[PDB]
Design a binder for these strands. Sequence first.
RNA 1: GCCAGGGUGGCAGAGGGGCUUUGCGGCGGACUGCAGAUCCGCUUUACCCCGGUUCGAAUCCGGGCCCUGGC
RNA 2: GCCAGGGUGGCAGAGGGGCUUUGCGGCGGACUGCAGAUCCGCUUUACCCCGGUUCGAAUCCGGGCCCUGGC
Lengths: 466, 465, 466, 465
Amino acid sequence: MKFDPQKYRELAEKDFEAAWKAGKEILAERSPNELYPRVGFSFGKEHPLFATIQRLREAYLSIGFSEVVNPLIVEDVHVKKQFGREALAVLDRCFYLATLPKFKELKPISSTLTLRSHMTTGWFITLSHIADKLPLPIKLFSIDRCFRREQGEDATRLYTYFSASCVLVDEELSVDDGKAVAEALLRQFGFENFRFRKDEKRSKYYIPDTQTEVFAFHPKLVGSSTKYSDGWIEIATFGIYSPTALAEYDIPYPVMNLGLGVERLAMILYGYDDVRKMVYPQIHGEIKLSDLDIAREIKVKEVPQTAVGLKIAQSIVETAEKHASEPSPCSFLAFEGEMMGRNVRVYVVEEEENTKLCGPAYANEVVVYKGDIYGIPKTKKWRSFFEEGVPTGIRYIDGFAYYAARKVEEAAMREQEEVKVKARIVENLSDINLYIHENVRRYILWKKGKIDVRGPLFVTVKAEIE
Amino acid sequence: MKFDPQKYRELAEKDFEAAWKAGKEILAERSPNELYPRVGFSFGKEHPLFATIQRLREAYLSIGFSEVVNPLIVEDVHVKKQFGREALAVLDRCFYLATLPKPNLKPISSTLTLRSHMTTGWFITLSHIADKLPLPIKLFSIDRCFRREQGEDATRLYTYFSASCVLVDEELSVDDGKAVAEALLRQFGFENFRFRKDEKRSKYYIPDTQTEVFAFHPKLVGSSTKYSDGWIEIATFGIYSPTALAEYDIPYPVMNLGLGVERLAMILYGYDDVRKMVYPQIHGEIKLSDLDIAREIKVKEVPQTAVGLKIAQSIVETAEKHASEPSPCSFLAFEGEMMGRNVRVYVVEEEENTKLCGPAYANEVVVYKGDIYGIPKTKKWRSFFEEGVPTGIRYIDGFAYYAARKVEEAAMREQEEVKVKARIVENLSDINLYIHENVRRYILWKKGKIDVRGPLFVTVKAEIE
Amino acid sequence: MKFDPQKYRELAEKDFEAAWKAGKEILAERSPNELYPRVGFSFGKEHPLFATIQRLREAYLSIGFSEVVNPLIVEDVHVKKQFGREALAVLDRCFYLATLPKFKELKPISSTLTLRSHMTTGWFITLSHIADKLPLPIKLFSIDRCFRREQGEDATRLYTYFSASCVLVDEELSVDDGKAVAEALLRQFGFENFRFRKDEKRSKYYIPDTQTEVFAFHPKLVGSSTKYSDGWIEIATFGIYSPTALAEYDIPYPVMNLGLGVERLAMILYGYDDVRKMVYPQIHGEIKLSDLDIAREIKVKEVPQTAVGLKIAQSIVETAEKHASEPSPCSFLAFEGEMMGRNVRVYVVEEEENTKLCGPAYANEVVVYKGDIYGIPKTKKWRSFFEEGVPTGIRYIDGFAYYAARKVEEAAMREQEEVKVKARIVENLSDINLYIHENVRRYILWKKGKIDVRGPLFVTVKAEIE
Amino acid sequence: MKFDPQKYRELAEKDFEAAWKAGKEILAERSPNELYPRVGFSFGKEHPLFATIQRLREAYLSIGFSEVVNPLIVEDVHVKKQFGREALAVLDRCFYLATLPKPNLKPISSTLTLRSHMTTGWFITLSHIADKLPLPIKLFSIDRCFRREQGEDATRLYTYFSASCVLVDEELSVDDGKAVAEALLRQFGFENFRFRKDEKRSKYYIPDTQTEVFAFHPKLVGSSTKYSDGWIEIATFGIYSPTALAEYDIPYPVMNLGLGVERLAMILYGYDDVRKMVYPQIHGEIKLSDLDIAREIKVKEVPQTAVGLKIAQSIVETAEKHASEPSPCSFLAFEGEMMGRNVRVYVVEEEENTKLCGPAYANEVVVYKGDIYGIPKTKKWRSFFEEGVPTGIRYIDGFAYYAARKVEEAAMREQEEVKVKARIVENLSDINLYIHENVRRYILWKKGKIDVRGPLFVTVKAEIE
RNA sequence: GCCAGGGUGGCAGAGGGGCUUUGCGGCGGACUGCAGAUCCGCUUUACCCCGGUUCGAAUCCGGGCCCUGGC
RNA sequence: GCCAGGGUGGCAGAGGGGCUUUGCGGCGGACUGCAGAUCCGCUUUACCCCGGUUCGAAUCCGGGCCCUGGC
């Protein structure tokens, strides 16, 4: 609550300790669902692919390459100009844009247009307009989507993917330029060593013998459940465009092209093994809450609506903790004072005999651990659950005590003169006045986790209002 | 050059002042083409589309939304499940993927479509989580979409970027959309918002929730465009219709807001034509600055010898003061030895009535607004000299280097005497300067001009002993 | 509210239009304080200094310099080693660290320790440990705080400040290296042209004649209320460290040092003219809300707590708009239905005669504009206010109507049989059932802005419950 | 090299296959020191402290807090207004600023102090806004603080970075602090939190609000440190006491959370000693990789002529197969002309019983774990060859270049015959290789070794006609 | 840094060795009023900081800052 | 891509031309019970996709995918 600067200055200057100890008055007194972990700020997370793409952007930028957007939709006449005869085997792995003619009848009519199968198809077009018109060397990059049909599968390969590519245009170029660029780039993503082998594919658009495959060594990978056990993985490729191809676009200068698969680099930088689970987690049921998250989701259902009632609840737990061993039958006044224009007396009791006030589980605490919600007691048997899971800070009596106080509160509204609520055996969270949204309940089942809140609460509260 | 600390330590515990002035001996002596601005670092420049995308990724994150990647390639049955009746239409604006049959031709269409808007992918994505994650759910995604519009590029482009988000919760209203729109747009500097109901009342959104958002950005008022009052339509949103949602087993309202990246990036980076902003190479937008072109203007022939330079420096020297003398006359500029052969360097003129040096000997090469000029440093030209970039190379300079190098060629061939002249400058070559074919080919393309002319009329004589 | 996937699928497949038009049921019906602009998400803004420092970090990184932290607290023996005799005039502008000896007695005892007056004092120390031990050239930078007492002022200069400095260590160096580096850096912050003049200060730690001052041309500045009218401003300096100084630390190689004032570059990149107002806005009363922000802060005080009551309020405005011209006296039933276990009749009226039901301002709307809150009517006289300020979307009758409905709601609780609330003349927001937090009210006064909500509302509501 | 498109266009409309194989003529022919890894780009690496600061600036922004700059230099009366009684103490840990009096000496202290914690600056900053801005107010600041601790650097450092925030509102509790702590720490990968009351109950926070926050980070379990169970104290917070607040006319509770950057950055980047993480130069942490040192191993003398190379390539060639032949013997490696003078190049050996080439002629120079080795490619060495970086230069190579260049020196001096030998390699020089003084001085400093040894025993004979 | 007029209450604005403005504005309040009102009550009695002069200084003097007509 | 055993309900698990498992689990419910229970009710009657065989296929055949003992 707010307070008075002057009053506190004038009292603190005379009796500082008083003022200080009094500061407590300005703090908010919280009802159960307003207490950490039940309260929390949140923040947006970012997807591993896009994190990687942005990193890659900064990687190429820092080594002097400039950003560019190449043509994505291209007349397949360009694959023919770039591959020669091999051209027809490349277009078999491509997609053609088809449209709908000018109702329920209509059917897609293919066209000549394609969706680039790789950044190269467009580098040519883009380079043709500026290779002889810009100061040399020209260093450009583009990280963007491409398409390539893959044996009609999502498992053998996704249909779309990102390629982080670049091009170096200079008068004098050797394969040592791709190597120099491959290293200056990967070394920023943590790789420490590199090996370059010649690609047996020897593609028509690359000067023969320049098409190199690049292997990098990454620490994170060493001793990994994968095959990249030794830390080495093929992470990129490159070459020097053929003059035959450059001609078809009238490019007079030699051009080094080095590109890389973004999906794979993300899998490495963020620890994934299944490309599809990495980019499409939701769709592949790869969702997950943390114990912390689930604990925050366990809420108290019935809660006293009066400052008086909160006290009443406090008192029932207060006096239940003390006299939790008084053999039955007994009774104690937990709270007496007035609420809602009338005096009230609330008592903790046990009617049955040959036992004690509170059952042997009244003090059990609800704690989340490795995905399940347990209703357990702080025993040297549940040490791990309490030291590793996250304790909700609610015990059976706590949940009950709030139930009770809400009841006696409702009574003193319905004018009634007496109300006595009692808890017997606990089968589930409901019996402890504790709930969780229907979505969290489904996440838990979907995830094959359990709710295990059971026990002998046997706690009774008698109230008499006037 | 490297030095010795003790030397300087003691060499100055004695007399500081001289030790200090001595330091200059450690500085590199630069030959003409190793001098600013002919030397410089460069760096990557990013593209405005992508910068904007990134700015949006951050803008969505700072307001709670987590990033997701939505299905791009989709069976057209999804568009049918989401639009219902009007679906027949909607599909005429999408593309379908076709493929070449494995002959033992013509591409054979399939039932797969490229998403025309992000919504097609959102329902799919949400069906796996909307019932198992704590509410609210706030997801977003800036990604590519494909749309055929008539079949023109001035109308719109085939591919574009959508920056959109979904907001799953138990109780939503058109107000949640407005709130989000503001939180996101305020971060790009928009100051005021106005919402209006979008007439097209699409069937995928609850009736009357589809809203069009207008925003006032200060950059825009005064705009050489029609956003002159500063307002512009920049986004749209709606709450999905349970008709569509129910098709995916999503049991809660879902707000969907989205905004076109291209329009935003054009506002932010100041572009008027989308295709010029996105594909500036393909649309002739290449652009070197003045400082960049100056950087490219180099001295063609330079003296390799240490004395080769001390020479041209003198040729340029004496001919600077005695440039005015009348013809004929001749001053001795240099004398010493190179390639182990003592020589004498002379600045001269033979003809009569004229003078030693033409009147353009001290004209400096300077770049301004894309053109390379060769002009004298007169008040008539201050603007060019003070807002353009002066190459630092004058007509004599360009020359004195060609001279001092031609004598170095005399000594190499045992020869005994050589005399190279200089009269009328019709260009850069004539002044011993060049620019690489690509920058020349650039200056042409950008319809720019080189104007290096003038009366140099300065001759050099030297004979190697 | 949530809904049923199956029920909606099975009805939409048969009668799509029905389902669709029915979708409206799942939308939340909002009470007045839950309507935009009264609702809004927010986000953290960043300070111009730190934005700039981070930009500068990326600027040096992209041009191949590496990050370093230099010594900030230094034995003044280092100024003596670096400046020679000029050393004592440099330490007069410095701060010495003083401590408190080992109560109320105690007094600070100076020491030999200083707080670097510039990044240079520390570059020497840092460079001594690695100039001969690392591959050449060495490119390092550091953007960090420095101190320099300035004639006992905050106006003539702040005592602390950031310096974004760097060093180039190579065997061969000329002043053309500082120029090349000054440009590759500034060109990233938008400057397009540069001029370098020799600094008359000719400082002892720089090889004579190398200490260059750097002037850059920036567009943003052209035609500016400043002196940088022409777009040129001195933005950095540089030099080549003296061998005399390098020796004192045993540095054998030549070193180029170029640094820059971060505060000034921020002022340019974010449009400020007073350094102190830029870094310490709060302290200099430079705070500010937007009309949008203030509009969001105008809340409705008394609000119906029953779905029934919201309707009642809706009806009073409903029937007040229609019959707002019926000469007095008159009366109309606005709403009749039951609320809280009893039937209720609410009427709009005017008891006085020779006028009409509603006053001539009942429809005035509260709109924020250029900082003041106005209670005005959509007249071709207030076009600008409505087209430029931000309309709250609340008019006198709206605020009142909610008051009323809350009253009749309270009545039907106190069992009462009749209640009649009436609005006469409006002097302020209070009279329209509209408030603003005490802080926003103070911001408005502090900012010298006004609240101008006046007018003849004269609206009456009679209710009769049973 | 540049080429002609028509040439290749037609030159292949005829026979593609050959036009393709022809392209290789456009590739640059690289001399030894222009080959990978002797060539490479480099780039700036950022410092872990500053990266962490930046990561925190983002972390605070994504949770609502706006950035502010707080007063650093402050009159000690503020510490007195905020701590009250215990203020006497608190000031003994701060520094005071002293200055030299303008003689017509010793520094004269003033009453100004460098802030030891961020709180000293927060009250000042908040007094101007806590009553005039809409609540809540959420501010933060990652900046420098000064603190004397005993007078040791192993204990703590004099300066450090504080990442802190304030949260002004009408109703706060210890819960707001925990919530914020989680929102901020979760973004650095901490998964579980435990809060405990800080015993020191400082007077600037309401009694019993001062909390110590412990967080579980997965990197930390297994930790070669004592955070082995993964938990660590990483931040602290409290709600200010109105005793302090009232001194500034702030009428609302204020939550203050703060966390040390240095500890966080050490966790994130894996450092055990703060001063080694912050000042790695001053504490000998310089570190070149293997690939970086390989890059620095260069061929000292290289043949300038085009044929100068075609030569050494052959010297290296024939001596590769016929390396095994017994002594004496002699093979003709090259014959053609350079500097316009036909010559013959021979690989030979005179002595007896031995062989042409020593047995270490094919030893490759490779870098591994900081040391430069000269070893043969045997299974005994795979680990070195497969995890280190092979310079690509073998003993003969290093040599054949020295040879082919010594004959180029024979032709330059009109001479007619020269013969250079090669026996026992005691090092890098002996194999015609060098590393710059700085990398050598580095390898020493990092107590690393160079091991270039072996029986080369290979001699070259050639006579220029 | 050199000559000079000067630093008054939230804004404004005269003034002047002791009491002393005034306007705007504000906030509290009253009203049979159908439009931006009317009226009563309201300040921390305000005159930068350090010295001097005096019984007394915002008013006088010295200095030091703070705006300037400035060189 | 080549040989072969094969793809059963949320998990598990036999089976087999028509009816047909079963265990775990779940959810709904009852209880005088002081600790993780007891009992009644509960499935979309489940057997990948396209053809064939048949009056009838999850059960038979051909093909196509999906795990494999694989070359």
